Design a binder for this molecule. Structure first.
Ligand SMILES: COc1ccccc1[C@@H]1C[C@@H]1NC(=O)c1ccc2nc[nH]c2c1
Ligand SMILES: [Zn+2]
Length: 318
């Protein structure tokens, strides 16, 4: 019965005073310096930056007061370049809780030929930094969770090595979804997997460009997409967003009709509800050397941080 609870789960709406406190409690400059900039490095699988990005993500989470439990899902797989090692990073509050809201991005960067190096600013260093800043900004509230909690997933190997294909893409997410699908949850249960425990997978990807438009991809998360719309509307109305227009909304309610392959596919195809926070169109700088810090829109990322943090608190009734 409990795997159906996600279908009836309600948010706890925060009032205006709470929303101001949340908007006050996140610091885009702190995130820029302390979470984003160390990740703006070459970090394709097995590179020195891959280990350094992984170590940076784990250290930023480990310094928080909330009782995050870190797991590294490391595995080998053949690739166009030969066998490679991949390591997904899983950061979980309340591991034995039956249900988790899951936030996720990919922390690898795409490999490009060797003056300029590809650091994937939007793709997806900024999503990584947004998740760490959410963990930091909500630490005291999350501390109060010490059958629903929060989990972060940083996928390795999202990018193709050579040619985007089912076999040359989503190495980490395809591995982790298979692993979770095969793993009892709660331990000792019959039937139910760790995937039954995923209330909702919120996948952040290609965030950081100015004027993003996120469409409503999936009917079975459309009501959660509408909460993002309503949070954006209310924060705007309260004057808590920067350089933001109602005529330039981030979250529009129409769909895409196509299929945007991404780390969520291995979870979606196994029944996990997905809120895919990827823009359409992709950023103009997408998969070019211009996907760098200079072309990021700080105020837009700040606004999305505020929207996402309100969303997560409301989801968790915190
Ligand atoms: C330079 O781009 C290419 C040229 C030739 C062959 C393959 C590619 C690259 C794989 C990408 N395709 C994508 O659909 C894609 C989908 C979701 C993503 N989330 C972050 N990044 C993404 C990229
Ligand atoms: Zn990419």
């Amino acid at each position: 019965a409990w795997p159906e609870e996600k279908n009836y789960h309600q948010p706890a709406i925060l009032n205006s005073s709470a929303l101001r406190q949340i908007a006050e409690g996140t610091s885009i400059s702190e995130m820029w310096q302390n979470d984003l900039q160390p990740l703006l490095i070459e970090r394709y699988p097995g590179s020195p930056g891959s280990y350094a990005a992984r170590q940076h993500i784990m250290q930023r989470i480990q310094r928080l007061q909330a009782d995050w439990v870190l797991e590294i899902d490391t595995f080998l797989s053949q690739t166009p370049e030969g066998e490679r090692s991949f390591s997904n990073i899983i950061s979980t509050l309340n591991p034995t809780a039956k249900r988790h809201l899951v936030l996720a991005c990919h922390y690898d960067s795409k490999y490009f030929s060797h003056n300029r190096v590809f650091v994937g600013a939007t793709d997806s260093a900024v999503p990584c930094a947004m998740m760490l800043e959410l963990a930091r900004a909500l630490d005291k509230k999350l501390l109060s969770l010490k059958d629903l909690s929060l989990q972060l997933i940083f996928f390795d190997g999202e990018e193709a090595f050579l040619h985007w294909s089912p076999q040359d893409s989503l190495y980490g997410s395809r591995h982790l979804a298979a692993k979770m699908a095969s793993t009892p949850h709660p331990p000792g249960a019959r039937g139910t997997s760790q995937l039954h425990g995923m209330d909702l997978l919120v996948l952040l990807d290609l965030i950081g460009a100015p004027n993003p438009t996120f469409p409503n991809f999936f009917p079975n998360s459309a009501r959660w997409f509408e909460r993002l719309q309503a949070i954006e509307h209310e924060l705007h109305e309260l004057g808590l967003l920067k350089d933001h227009s109602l005529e330039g909304r981030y979250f529009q309610n129409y769909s895409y009709g196509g299929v945007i392959q991404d780390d969520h596919i291995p979870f979606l195809r196994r029944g996990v509800p997905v809120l895919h926070l990827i823009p359409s169109p992709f950023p103009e700088v997408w998969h070019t050397m211009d996907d760098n810090e200079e072309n990021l829109d700080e105020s837009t990322i700040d606004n999305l941080n505020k929207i996402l943090q309100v969303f997560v608190l409301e989801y968790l009734h915190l």
